[PDB]
Coordinates of C-alpha atoms in Angstrom, one line a residue:
Chain C
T424 CA -10.1 -25.0 -43.7
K425 CA -10.9 -23.0 -40.6
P426 CA -10.9 -19.2 -41.5
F427 CA -8.1 -17.1 -39.9
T428 CA -9.3 -14.3 -37.6
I429 CA -7.8 -11.6 -35.3
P430 CA -9.4 -10.3 -32.1
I431 CA -11.5 -7.1 -32.4
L432 CA -10.1 -5.7 -29.1
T433 CA -8.7 -2.3 -29.6
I434 CA -5.1 -1.3 -28.8
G435 CA -6.3 0.3 -25.6
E436 CA -7.9 -3.0 -24.5
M437 CA -4.9 -5.3 -24.9
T438 CA -1.6 -6.1 -23.1
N439 CA 2.0 -6.1 -24.2
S440 CA 3.3 -9.7 -24.7
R441 CA 6.8 -8.9 -23.4
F442 CA 5.9 -7.1 -20.1
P443 CA 2.5 -7.2 -18.3
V444 CA 1.4 -3.6 -19.0
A445 CA -1.2 -2.1 -21.3
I446 CA -0.1 -1.1 -24.8
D447 CA 0.4 2.7 -25.0
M448 CA 1.0 3.1 -28.8
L449 CA 2.0 1.7 -32.1
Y450 CA 5.6 2.5 -33.3
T451 CA 7.9 1.9 -36.2
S452 CA 11.7 2.2 -36.5
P453 CA 14.5 1.0 -38.8
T454 CA 16.2 -2.2 -37.6
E455 CA 18.7 -3.2 -40.2
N456 CA 21.6 -2.9 -37.7
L457 CA 19.6 -4.8 -35.0
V458 CA 18.8 -8.5 -34.4
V459 CA 15.1 -8.4 -33.3
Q460 CA 14.7 -11.8 -31.7
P461 CA 12.4 -11.5 -28.6
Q462 CA 11.5 -14.8 -26.9
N463 CA 8.2 -13.7 -25.2
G464 CA 5.3 -12.7 -27.4
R465 CA 6.2 -15.3 -30.1
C466 CA 3.4 -17.2 -31.8
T467 CA 2.8 -18.2 -35.4
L468 CA -0.5 -17.4 -37.0
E469 CA -1.4 -21.1 -36.8
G470 CA -1.1 -20.9 -33.0
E471 CA 2.4 -22.4 -32.4
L472 CA 4.0 -20.8 -29.4
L473 CA 7.7 -20.2 -29.8
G474 CA 10.6 -19.2 -27.6
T475 CA 9.6 -18.8 -23.9
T476 CA 6.1 -17.7 -24.8
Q477 CA 3.2 -18.7 -22.5
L478 CA -0.4 -17.7 -22.2
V479 CA -0.8 -16.2 -18.7
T480 CA -0.5 -12.4 -19.0
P481 CA 0.7 -11.7 -15.4
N482 CA 3.3 -14.4 -15.8
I483 CA 5.2 -12.5 -18.4
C484 CA 8.6 -11.6 -16.9
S485 CA 7.6 -13.5 -13.7
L486 CA 9.6 -16.3 -12.2
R487 CA 8.8 -18.5 -9.3
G488 CA 10.3 -21.4 -7.3
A489 CA 12.0 -21.3 -3.9
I490 CA 15.0 -19.6 -2.3
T491 CA 17.6 -22.1 -1.2
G492 CA 20.4 -19.9 0.2
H493 CA 22.5 -16.8 -0.3
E494 CA 24.3 -16.0 -3.5
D495 CA 28.2 -11.6 2.3
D496 CA 25.5 -9.2 3.6
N497 CA 25.0 -8.4 -0.1
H498 CA 21.3 -9.2 0.1
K499 CA 21.6 -11.6 -2.9
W500 CA 19.7 -14.9 -2.9
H501 CA 19.8 -18.1 -4.9
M502 CA 16.2 -18.7 -6.3
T503 CA 15.3 -22.0 -8.0
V504 CA 13.0 -21.6 -10.9
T505 CA 10.1 -24.1 -11.4
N506 CA 6.9 -24.4 -13.4
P507 CA 4.0 -22.4 -12.0
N508 CA 2.7 -25.2 -9.8
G509 CA 6.1 -25.6 -8.2
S510 CA 7.2 -28.7 -10.1
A511 CA 10.7 -29.0 -11.5
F512 CA 10.8 -28.2 -15.2
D513 CA 12.4 -30.6 -17.8
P514 CA 15.6 -28.9 -18.9
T515 CA 16.0 -31.1 -21.9
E516 CA 13.1 -29.5 -23.7
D517 CA 13.9 -27.5 -26.8
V518 CA 13.1 -24.2 -25.2
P519 CA 15.4 -21.4 -24.1
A520 CA 14.4 -21.1 -20.5
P521 CA 11.3 -21.6 -18.3
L522 CA 8.3 -20.0 -20.0
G523 CA 7.8 -16.3 -19.2
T524 CA 11.5 -15.7 -18.3
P525 CA 12.6 -12.1 -19.1
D526 CA 13.9 -12.0 -22.7
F527 CA 16.2 -8.9 -22.5
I528 CA 19.4 -7.6 -20.9
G529 CA 18.5 -5.4 -17.9
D530 CA 17.8 -5.3 -14.2
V531 CA 14.2 -6.3 -13.7
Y532 CA 12.5 -4.6 -10.8
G533 CA 9.6 -6.0 -8.9
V534 CA 8.5 -7.6 -5.7
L535 CA 9.7 -10.9 -4.1
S536 CA 6.9 -12.6 -2.2
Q537 CA 6.9 -15.7 -0.1
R538 CA 4.3 -17.9 1.6
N539 CA 5.8 -20.5 3.8
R540 CA 5.2 -24.2 3.1
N541 CA 5.0 -25.0 6.8
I542 CA 2.5 -24.0 9.5
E543 CA 4.1 -23.5 12.9
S544 CA 2.7 -24.9 16.2
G545 CA 0.1 -22.5 17.5
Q546 CA -0.8 -21.1 14.1
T547 CA -3.4 -22.2 11.5
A548 CA -1.9 -20.3 8.5
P549 CA 1.6 -19.9 7.1
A550 CA 3.9 -17.0 7.5
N551 CA 4.5 -14.5 4.7
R552 CA 6.9 -11.8 3.6
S553 CA 7.3 -9.5 0.6
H554 CA 10.0 -7.0 -0.4
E555 CA 11.1 -4.9 -3.4
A556 CA 13.6 -6.9 -5.4
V557 CA 15.7 -7.0 -8.6
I558 CA 16.5 -10.0 -10.9
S559 CA 19.4 -8.9 -13.0
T560 CA 19.5 -10.8 -16.3
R561 CA 23.1 -9.7 -16.9
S562 CA 24.5 -11.4 -13.8
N563 CA 26.6 -14.5 -14.2
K564 CA 24.1 -16.0 -11.8
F565 CA 21.1 -15.5 -14.1
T566 CA 20.9 -19.2 -15.2
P567 CA 17.2 -19.9 -15.6
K568 CA 17.7 -22.7 -18.1
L569 CA 19.8 -24.4 -15.4
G570 CA 17.0 -23.8 -12.9
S571 CA 18.2 -20.8 -10.9
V572 CA 18.5 -17.0 -10.8
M573 CA 20.0 -14.5 -8.4
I574 CA 17.4 -12.2 -6.8
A575 CA 18.4 -9.2 -4.7
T576 CA 16.8 -7.0 -2.1
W577 CA 17.6 -3.6 -0.6
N578 CA 18.7 -3.4 3.0
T579 CA 16.8 -6.5 4.3
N580 CA 17.8 -10.1 5.0
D581 CA 14.2 -11.1 5.8
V582 CA 14.1 -13.8 3.2
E583 CA 13.6 -17.5 4.0
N584 CA 14.3 -20.8 2.2
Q585 CA 10.6 -20.9 1.2
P586 CA 8.3 -20.8 -1.9
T587 CA 8.9 -17.5 -3.7
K588 CA 7.3 -15.6 -6.5
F589 CA 8.7 -12.5 -8.4
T590 CA 6.0 -10.0 -9.6
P591 CA 7.5 -7.7 -12.2
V592 CA 7.0 -4.0 -12.0
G593 CA 9.6 -2.4 -14.3
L594 CA 13.4 -1.9 -14.4
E595 CA 15.8 -0.8 -11.7
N596 CA 17.6 1.6 -14.0
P597 CA 17.5 2.6 -17.6
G598 CA 21.2 2.5 -18.5
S599 CA 21.7 -1.2 -18.4
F600 CA 18.4 -2.0 -20.3
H601 CA 18.8 -3.3 -23.9
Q602 CA 15.5 -4.7 -25.0
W603 CA 16.8 -6.5 -28.1
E604 CA 19.9 -8.1 -26.4
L605 CA 19.1 -11.6 -25.2
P606 CA 20.5 -12.8 -21.9
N607 CA 22.5 -15.9 -21.5
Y608 CA 19.8 -18.3 -20.2
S609 CA 22.5 -20.8 -19.1
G610 CA 25.1 -18.3 -17.9
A611 CA 28.4 -17.0 -19.0
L612 CA 30.0 -18.2 -22.2
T613 CA 27.1 -20.6 -23.0
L614 CA 24.9 -20.3 -26.0
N615 CA 21.1 -20.3 -25.9
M616 CA 19.0 -23.0 -27.5
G617 CA 15.4 -23.4 -28.8
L618 CA 15.2 -19.8 -29.8
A619 CA 12.4 -18.2 -31.7
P620 CA 14.1 -16.8 -34.8
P621 CA 14.9 -13.2 -35.7
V622 CA 12.2 -11.2 -37.5
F623 CA 12.6 -8.5 -40.1
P624 CA 10.9 -7.1 -43.2
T625 CA 11.9 -8.8 -46.5
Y626 CA 10.1 -6.5 -48.9
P627 CA 11.8 -3.1 -49.9
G628 CA 10.5 0.0 -48.1
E629 CA 9.1 -1.8 -45.1
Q630 CA 9.8 -1.6 -41.4
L631 CA 8.6 -3.6 -38.4
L632 CA 5.6 -2.3 -36.5
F633 CA 5.7 -2.6 -32.7
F634 CA 3.1 -2.5 -29.9
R635 CA 5.0 -0.2 -27.5
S636 CA 4.5 0.3 -23.8
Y637 CA 6.2 2.5 -21.2
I638 CA 8.0 0.5 -18.6
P639 CA 8.4 1.9 -15.0
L640 CA 11.8 2.8 -13.5
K641 CA 12.9 2.4 -9.9
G642 CA 15.2 5.4 -10.4
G643 CA 17.2 7.4 -13.0
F644 CA 16.7 9.7 -15.9
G645 CA 14.9 7.9 -18.7
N646 CA 11.8 7.3 -20.6
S647 CA 12.0 3.5 -21.0
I648 CA 9.8 1.6 -23.3
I649 CA 9.4 -2.0 -24.4
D650 CA 8.1 -3.2 -27.8
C651 CA 6.3 -6.4 -28.6
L652 CA 5.5 -8.0 -32.0
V653 CA 1.8 -8.8 -31.3
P654 CA -0.4 -8.3 -28.3
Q655 CA -0.8 -11.1 -25.7
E656 CA -4.5 -11.4 -26.5
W657 CA -3.6 -12.2 -30.2
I658 CA -1.3 -15.0 -28.9
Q659 CA -4.2 -16.5 -26.9
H660 CA -6.5 -16.2 -29.9
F661 CA -4.2 -17.8 -32.4
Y662 CA -3.3 -20.6 -30.0
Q663 CA -7.0 -21.5 -29.5
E664 CA -8.0 -21.1 -33.2
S665 CA -5.1 -22.9 -34.9
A666 CA -6.4 -21.7 -38.3
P667 CA -4.2 -22.7 -41.2
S668 CA -2.2 -20.0 -42.9
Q669 CA -3.0 -20.0 -46.6
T670 CA 0.0 -17.8 -47.6
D671 CA 3.0 -16.4 -45.8
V672 CA 1.3 -12.9 -45.3
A673 CA -2.1 -11.7 -44.1
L674 CA -3.1 -8.3 -45.3
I675 CA -4.6 -6.4 -42.3
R676 CA -6.2 -3.0 -42.0
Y677 CA -6.3 -0.7 -38.9
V678 CA -10.0 0.2 -38.5
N679 CA -12.0 2.4 -36.2
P680 CA -14.8 0.1 -34.9
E681 CA -17.3 3.0 -34.5
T682 CA -17.1 4.5 -38.0
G683 CA -15.5 1.8 -40.1
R684 CA -12.8 4.2 -41.2
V685 CA -9.6 2.5 -42.4
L686 CA -6.4 4.4 -41.2
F687 CA -3.6 2.3 -42.7
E688 CA -2.7 -1.3 -43.9
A689 CA 0.0 -3.7 -42.9
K690 CA 1.4 -7.2 -43.4
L691 CA 0.9 -9.8 -40.7
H692 CA 3.5 -12.4 -41.4
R693 CA 2.9 -16.1 -40.8
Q694 CA 5.8 -16.1 -38.3
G695 CA 3.9 -13.7 -36.0
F696 CA 5.0 -10.1 -36.7
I697 CA 3.8 -7.0 -38.6
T698 CA 5.5 -4.8 -41.2
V699 CA 4.4 -1.5 -42.7
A700 CA 5.4 0.7 -45.6
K701 CA 7.0 3.5 -43.6
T702 CA 10.6 4.6 -43.1
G703 CA 12.1 6.3 -40.1
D704 CA 11.7 6.3 -36.4
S705 CA 8.1 7.4 -35.6
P706 CA 5.0 6.7 -33.5
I707 CA 2.0 5.7 -35.5
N708 CA -0.4 8.6 -35.1
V709 CA -3.7 6.7 -34.9
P710 CA -6.3 6.6 -32.1
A711 CA -6.1 3.8 -29.6
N712 CA -9.7 2.9 -30.3
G713 CA -8.8 1.0 -33.4
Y714 CA -8.2 -2.7 -34.1
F715 CA -6.6 -4.7 -36.9
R716 CA -9.0 -6.5 -39.3
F717 CA -7.9 -9.4 -41.5
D718 CA -8.9 -8.7 -45.1
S719 CA -7.0 -11.2 -47.3
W720 CA -4.2 -13.6 -47.7
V721 CA -1.6 -12.1 -50.1
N722 CA 1.8 -12.7 -51.5
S723 CA 5.0 -11.6 -49.7
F724 CA 5.6 -9.0 -52.4
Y725 CA 2.2 -7.3 -52.1
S726 CA 2.9 -3.5 -52.2
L727 CA 1.4 -1.8 -49.2
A728 CA -0.1 1.7 -49.4
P729 CA 2.6 3.9 -47.9
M730 CA 1.9 5.6 -44.6
Chain K
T310 CA -28.6 -15.9 -33.9
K311 CA -24.8 -15.9 -33.5
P312 CA -23.9 -19.0 -31.5
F313 CA -22.6 -18.6 -27.9
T314 CA -19.1 -19.9 -27.3
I315 CA -16.6 -20.0 -24.4
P316 CA -12.8 -19.9 -24.7
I317 CA -11.0 -23.3 -24.8
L318 CA -8.1 -22.0 -22.6
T319 CA -7.6 -24.2 -19.6
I320 CA -7.8 -23.0 -16.1
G321 CA -4.0 -22.8 -15.9
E322 CA -3.9 -20.5 -19.0
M323 CA -6.2 -17.8 -17.7
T324 CA -6.2 -14.8 -15.3
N325 CA -8.3 -13.8 -12.4
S326 CA -10.6 -11.0 -13.2
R327 CA -10.4 -9.4 -9.8
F328 CA -6.6 -9.3 -9.3
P329 CA -4.0 -9.6 -12.0
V330 CA -2.6 -13.1 -11.2
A331 CA -3.1 -16.6 -12.7
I332 CA -6.0 -18.7 -11.5
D333 CA -4.8 -21.4 -9.1
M334 CA -7.9 -23.6 -8.7
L335 CA -11.7 -23.9 -8.8
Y336 CA -13.4 -23.6 -5.4
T337 CA -17.0 -23.8 -4.0
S338 CA -18.3 -22.6 -0.7
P339 CA -21.7 -21.8 0.9
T340 CA -22.6 -18.1 0.7
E341 CA -26.1 -17.8 2.1
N342 CA -24.9 -15.4 4.8
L343 CA -22.7 -13.3 2.5
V344 CA -23.5 -10.7 -0.2
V345 CA -21.4 -11.7 -3.1
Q346 CA -21.3 -8.5 -5.2
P347 CA -17.9 -8.0 -6.8
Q348 CA -17.5 -5.1 -9.2
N349 CA -14.5 -6.3 -11.2
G350 CA -14.9 -9.4 -13.3
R351 CA -18.5 -8.7 -14.2
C352 CA -19.8 -9.3 -17.7
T353 CA -23.0 -10.8 -18.9
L354 CA -22.9 -13.7 -21.4
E355 CA -24.0 -11.2 -24.1
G356 CA -20.8 -9.1 -23.5
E357 CA -22.2 -6.3 -21.3
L358 CA -19.5 -5.1 -18.9
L359 CA -20.8 -4.2 -15.4
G360 CA -19.6 -2.6 -12.2
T361 CA -16.0 -1.3 -12.6
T362 CA -15.1 -4.0 -15.1
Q363 CA -12.6 -3.2 -17.8
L364 CA -10.6 -5.4 -20.3
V365 CA -6.9 -4.6 -19.6
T366 CA -5.7 -7.4 -17.4
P367 CA -2.8 -5.6 -15.6
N368 CA -5.0 -2.6 -14.9
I369 CA -7.2 -4.7 -12.5
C370 CA -6.6 -3.1 -9.0
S371 CA -4.4 -0.4 -10.6
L372 CA -4.9 3.3 -10.2
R373 CA -3.0 6.2 -11.8
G374 CA -3.0 10.0 -11.7
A375 CA -0.7 12.5 -10.0
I376 CA 0.5 13.1 -6.4
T377 CA -0.4 16.7 -5.3
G378 CA 1.3 16.5 -1.9
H379 CA 0.7 15.0 1.5
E380 CA -2.7 13.8 2.6
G381 CA -3.4 16.0 5.6
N382 CA -0.5 17.4 7.5
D383 CA 0.1 15.0 10.4
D384 CA 1.7 11.9 8.7
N385 CA 4.6 12.1 6.3
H386 CA 3.9 8.5 5.1
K387 CA 0.6 9.6 3.5
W388 CA 0.1 11.2 0.0
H389 CA -2.8 12.6 -1.9
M390 CA -3.2 11.0 -5.4
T391 CA -5.6 12.1 -8.0
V392 CA -7.3 9.3 -10.0
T393 CA -7.6 9.7 -13.8
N394 CA -8.1 7.6 -16.9
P395 CA -4.9 5.7 -18.0
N396 CA -3.9 8.4 -20.5
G397 CA -4.0 11.1 -17.7
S398 CA -7.4 12.5 -18.6
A399 CA -10.0 13.3 -16.0
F400 CA -12.9 10.8 -16.0
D401 CA -16.5 11.8 -16.2
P402 CA -17.9 11.2 -12.7
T403 CA -21.6 11.5 -13.6
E404 CA -21.4 8.1 -15.3
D405 CA -23.6 5.4 -13.7
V406 CA -20.4 3.5 -12.7
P407 CA -19.3 3.0 -9.1
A408 CA -15.7 4.2 -9.6
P409 CA -13.0 4.5 -12.2
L410 CA -12.7 1.2 -14.0
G411 CA -10.4 -1.4 -12.4
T412 CA -10.6 0.3 -8.9
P413 CA -10.2 -2.4 -6.2
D414 CA -13.6 -3.9 -5.3
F415 CA -12.9 -5.1 -1.7
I416 CA -12.0 -3.9 1.8
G417 CA -8.3 -4.3 2.4
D418 CA -4.9 -2.7 2.3
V419 CA -3.7 -3.1 -1.3
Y420 CA 0.1 -3.6 -1.4
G421 CA 2.1 -2.7 -4.5
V422 CA 4.5 -0.2 -6.0
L423 CA 4.0 3.4 -6.8
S424 CA 6.1 4.6 -9.8
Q425 CA 6.6 8.1 -11.0
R426 CA 8.0 9.5 -14.3
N427 CA 8.3 13.3 -14.1
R428 CA 6.4 15.5 -16.5
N429 CA 9.5 17.9 -16.6
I430 CA 13.0 17.5 -18.1
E431 CA 15.7 19.2 -16.1
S432 CA 18.4 21.4 -17.7
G433 CA 21.3 19.2 -18.9
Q434 CA 19.0 16.2 -19.2
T435 CA 17.1 14.7 -22.3
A436 CA 14.7 12.4 -20.2
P437 CA 12.7 12.8 -17.1
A438 CA 13.6 11.7 -13.5
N439 CA 11.9 8.6 -12.1
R440 CA 11.3 7.0 -8.7
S441 CA 9.4 3.9 -7.4
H442 CA 8.6 2.8 -3.9
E443 CA 6.6 0.1 -2.1
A444 CA 3.2 1.5 -1.3
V445 CA -0.3 0.8 0.1
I446 CA -3.7 2.0 -1.0
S447 CA -6.1 1.2 1.9
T448 CA -9.7 0.9 0.6
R449 CA -11.0 1.3 4.2
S450 CA -9.5 4.8 4.6
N451 CA -12.0 7.7 4.7
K452 CA -9.6 9.2 2.1
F453 CA -10.3 6.3 -0.3
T454 CA -12.6 8.4 -2.6
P455 CA -11.8 7.2 -6.1
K456 CA -15.3 8.1 -7.5
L457 CA -14.5 11.7 -6.3
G458 CA -11.1 11.5 -8.0
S459 CA -8.6 10.8 -5.3
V460 CA -7.2 8.2 -2.9
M461 CA -4.6 8.3 -0.1
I462 CA -1.5 6.3 -0.9
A463 CA 1.0 5.4 1.9
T464 CA 4.7 4.6 1.7
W465 CA 7.3 3.4 4.2
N466 CA 9.6 6.1 2.6
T467 CA 8.8 9.6 3.8
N468 CA 10.8 11.9 1.5
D469 CA 11.2 10.6 -2.1
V470 CA 7.7 11.0 -3.5
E471 CA 7.2 14.0 -5.8
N472 CA 4.2 16.0 -7.0
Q473 CA 4.3 14.1 -10.4
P474 CA 2.5 11.6 -12.5
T475 CA 2.1 8.4 -10.5
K476 CA 0.9 4.8 -11.2
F477 CA 0.1 2.1 -8.7
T478 CA 1.0 -1.5 -9.7
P479 CA -0.8 -4.0 -7.4
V480 CA 1.1 -7.0 -6.0
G481 CA -1.1 -8.2 -3.1
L482 CA -2.2 -7.2 0.4
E483 CA -0.3 -5.5 3.2
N484 CA -1.9 -7.8 5.9
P485 CA -4.5 -10.5 6.0
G486 CA -6.6 -9.3 9.0
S487 CA -8.3 -6.3 7.3
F488 CA -9.0 -8.2 4.0
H489 CA -12.7 -8.9 3.4
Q490 CA -13.0 -9.8 -0.3
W491 CA -16.9 -9.6 -0.4
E492 CA -17.1 -6.3 1.5
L493 CA -17.3 -3.3 -0.9
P494 CA -15.5 -0.1 -0.2
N495 CA -17.1 3.3 -0.1
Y496 CA -16.0 4.6 -3.5
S497 CA -17.2 8.2 -2.5
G498 CA -16.1 8.0 1.2
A499 CA -17.7 7.9 4.6
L500 CA -21.5 7.7 4.9
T501 CA -22.0 7.8 1.1
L502 CA -23.6 5.0 -0.8
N503 CA -22.2 3.4 -4.0
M504 CA -23.9 3.9 -7.4
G505 CA -24.0 1.9 -10.6
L506 CA -23.3 -1.4 -8.8
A507 CA -23.3 -4.8 -10.6
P508 CA -25.9 -6.7 -8.6
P509 CA -25.3 -9.5 -6.1
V510 CA -25.1 -13.1 -7.4
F511 CA -26.3 -16.3 -5.7
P512 CA -27.6 -19.7 -6.6
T513 CA -31.4 -20.1 -6.6
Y514 CA -31.9 -23.8 -7.3
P515 CA -31.8 -26.0 -4.2
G516 CA -28.5 -27.9 -3.5
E517 CA -26.4 -25.5 -5.5
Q518 CA -23.4 -23.2 -4.6
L519 CA -21.4 -20.6 -6.5
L520 CA -18.2 -21.9 -8.2
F521 CA -15.2 -19.6 -8.1
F522 CA -12.0 -19.2 -10.0
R523 CA -9.6 -18.8 -7.0
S524 CA -6.1 -17.3 -6.8
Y525 CA -3.6 -16.9 -4.0
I526 CA -3.0 -13.2 -3.3
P527 CA 0.5 -12.3 -1.9
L528 CA 1.0 -10.8 1.6
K529 CA 3.6 -8.2 2.6
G530 CA 3.6 -9.9 6.0
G531 CA 1.5 -11.8 8.6
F532 CA 0.2 -15.3 9.1
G533 CA -2.3 -16.0 6.4
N534 CA -3.3 -18.0 3.2
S535 CA -5.1 -15.1 1.5
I536 CA -7.0 -15.8 -1.7
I537 CA -9.3 -13.9 -4.0
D538 CA -12.2 -15.4 -5.9
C539 CA -13.6 -14.3 -9.3
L540 CA -16.9 -15.3 -11.1
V541 CA -15.4 -15.8 -14.5
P542 CA -11.8 -15.5 -15.9
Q543 CA -10.7 -12.2 -17.5
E544 CA -10.3 -14.1 -20.8
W545 CA -14.0 -15.0 -20.7
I546 CA -14.9 -11.3 -20.2
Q547 CA -12.7 -10.4 -23.2
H548 CA -14.4 -13.2 -25.3
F549 CA -18.0 -12.4 -24.4
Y550 CA -17.4 -8.6 -24.9
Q551 CA -16.1 -9.3 -28.5
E552 CA -18.7 -12.0 -29.5
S553 CA -21.9 -10.4 -28.1
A554 CA -23.8 -13.6 -28.8
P555 CA -27.5 -13.5 -27.7
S556 CA -28.4 -15.6 -24.6
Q557 CA -31.2 -18.0 -25.6
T558 CA -32.1 -18.9 -22.0
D559 CA -31.0 -17.8 -18.6
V560 CA -28.6 -20.7 -18.2
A561 CA -25.9 -22.3 -20.3
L562 CA -25.0 -25.9 -19.4
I563 CA -21.2 -26.3 -19.3
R564 CA -19.1 -29.4 -18.8
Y565 CA -15.5 -29.4 -17.5
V566 CA -13.5 -31.4 -20.1
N567 CA -9.9 -32.6 -20.5
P568 CA -8.9 -31.3 -24.0
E569 CA -6.4 -34.2 -24.6
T570 CA -8.7 -37.1 -23.8
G571 CA -12.3 -35.7 -24.0
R572 CA -13.1 -36.9 -20.4
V573 CA -15.9 -34.9 -18.8
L574 CA -15.3 -34.4 -15.0
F575 CA -18.4 -32.5 -14.0
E576 CA -21.1 -30.2 -15.2
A577 CA -22.2 -26.7 -14.1
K578 CA -24.6 -23.9 -14.9
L579 CA -23.3 -20.7 -16.4
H580 CA -25.9 -18.0 -15.7
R581 CA -26.7 -15.2 -18.2
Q582 CA -25.6 -12.7 -15.5
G583 CA -22.0 -14.0 -15.7
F584 CA -21.5 -16.6 -12.9
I585 CA -21.4 -20.3 -12.3
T586 CA -23.2 -22.6 -9.9
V587 CA -22.6 -26.4 -9.2
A588 CA -24.5 -29.1 -7.3
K589 CA -22.2 -29.3 -4.3
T590 CA -22.5 -28.3 -0.7
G591 CA -19.7 -27.4 1.7
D592 CA -16.5 -25.5 1.5
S593 CA -14.2 -27.3 -0.8
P594 CA -11.6 -27.1 -3.6
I595 CA -12.7 -28.7 -6.8
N596 CA -10.4 -31.7 -7.2
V597 CA -9.7 -31.7 -10.9
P598 CA -6.5 -31.1 -12.9
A599 CA -6.0 -27.5 -14.1
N600 CA -5.6 -28.8 -17.7
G601 CA -9.3 -28.6 -18.3
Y602 CA -11.7 -26.1 -19.8
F603 CA -15.4 -25.5 -19.7
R604 CA -17.3 -26.5 -22.9
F605 CA -20.7 -25.1 -23.7
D606 CA -23.1 -28.0 -24.5
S607 CA -26.7 -26.6 -24.3
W608 CA -29.0 -23.8 -23.3
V609 CA -31.2 -25.1 -20.4
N610 CA -33.7 -23.9 -17.9
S611 CA -32.7 -22.4 -14.5
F612 CA -34.2 -25.5 -12.8
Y613 CA -32.0 -28.0 -14.8
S614 CA -31.0 -30.6 -12.2
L615 CA -27.2 -30.9 -12.4
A616 CA -25.4 -34.2 -11.8
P617 CA -24.1 -33.9 -8.2
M618 CA -20.4 -33.5 -7.7

C-alpha cells in the first residue's frame, strides 16, 4: 500500500484552489447554518477529482470558447464555453459544468481577450483585442453546463465572433458575492448535477479550517475574501500519488520547517477537507512559513488538542 | 541517495513558469544567435531556485506595493508604484538576486489590472474603498527599477488611482512589437547592469536544440501570435524544490510517454541546470498529444546520443 503524503510547501508557497491567487492565511468559522459545497478545489485523499475541479492553477475561474453574438448597446455578449483546446465538451458527463467554471454567486471581474482564427490578406499574424469584462454567475444567461455564458464589457463594442478567453482578476462588486451559494449551471429554475457533496465536521467541538485569500474588487466598500478547502498544490499531489486512505481521517500537524516546532493539529478527512478543535470566527495565528505534516491515520472520533 | 523523480502531470495539466497561464505545446528552435537567459522558471534538478524564481504560480509577472502619486509631472496616465514583498514589507535589496521574486524577466509592455484596497476606513463605513483599472507595466521604461523598489505603472484612466496599496495582476502584453522574450530588462534602470542572474542555457552536444514549454500570451491589441517559452513547468520547480534529490550526473535521460498506453514518443536530455535539449534542428512545434508526461529513465553522460526526432 503506497504511503499517503502531503506536500511540504508552506502556506506562503501555495495557491487557493477556488481562485488563482496566493493563500493569505488560515481561518476558521462556525458553519452550521451554511451549506459549504464548493465545486472547485475538490479532491479526495486518494486523488479523485470532484465537482468542477481541474489541475491547471490559472484556469480556476477561467472560461474559454468563442463569442457568437450579442446577448441593445448593452455591451453584453454570448460566449460559448469549450474545453481548453477549443473542443466542444460532452454535456452528458456527470459533472456540474466545464472544469474550472466559477463555483459561487457573484460578478466575476477580469479580462476578455481574443486572438482571431483568421489571418487577413496582407498580414502574417491574426488580429487581437482585450478588454476588462464581467461574467455574472447570477444572470439567467449564465448557463455553462449548456455551453454558454454572458460576458459584458464597459463602454466598448470592440468584440468579434472569435476565439475568446476570460482571465479572472476578482469581483466587480462585493454586495452580490456569496461564496457558498452555488450558481445555476444550467440557468433559471434548473437543478445542478454531478456535484461534489457538502462538507462539515461530524465530531463535537470542531469547525472547518479554510485556506483564505483576499480577492480584488473593481469597486465598492469591502474586504472580500474567498476560502478553499485545500490548496491547489495538494490537489495536484493527491491526483498523482493516488495513495489509499487507510481510515476516514488523517491526523496532520502544522509544523515550522526550520525549527520543527508543532503549532497545532487537525483532521484531514478522506473527502478532502480539514477540521480543527476551535469554536468561533477567527484567523489562525500562525506564521505562513509552516506546512501540514501527515502523522497518522486515526478514527473519526479522535479528540484533537484544542486550539 | 534520494532518488530523483519528475511529476507525472501531463503537459495539459501544468503551468508556464514565466507567465501564469497553461502550457499549450512543446516547441524547439535554433538559438545559436540568442542569449537564452530567463530569470523566472529557473531551478536546478536538486531544487535550488535561481534568478527571480519563486513558487507561487499567480505571482509570476505580478508586482505589488503602493502608489505614491504620479511618475513625473508631465503625464497623468503614469503612476509611481513602490515594489514590496507580497505582505507589504520592504524587501532586502542587498540580496544577490536580480529583482524582487516574480518580476517580469523580458522586455515588453506587460498588460494587466491594477487593483487597490485602501488602508483606511472612512467614517460611516466598516470596510475600505477599492478600485481596479486596466494597466501597463513597461519593462523598457527608464522608470522600470524594481531592484531599487519602484516601477512606473500606466493606465488609460487618468483620475481614479489613489495613493494606496496596489497589486498588478498580469494578463498579457499591450502590443507585440516591443516584446522580446529573451531580452532582459534593466532591473536597476538605465546604464546599470543586472546582478545575481541565473546563467544562460544552451545545448552543447552537436545536433541538439533547446526544448521549450510554450504558451500563447494574450495581446491588448495588434496583429500578432505572441508566445512565451519556459525551460521547465512551474510544477516541476515546486517538485524539485521539495525533493532536493542529488543529481548523480549532469544529465537525466527523459522519455515522453502516454500514461494510458505506455507508448514512448521521443527522448530528451534534462540538464542538471534545469533545462531540456532534444536531437532536432529547425523551428518546429513538437507534434505529440498534450496527454503525455516526461518519465525519468536514467542518469547519463552529457554526450549521450539521443534518438533523433
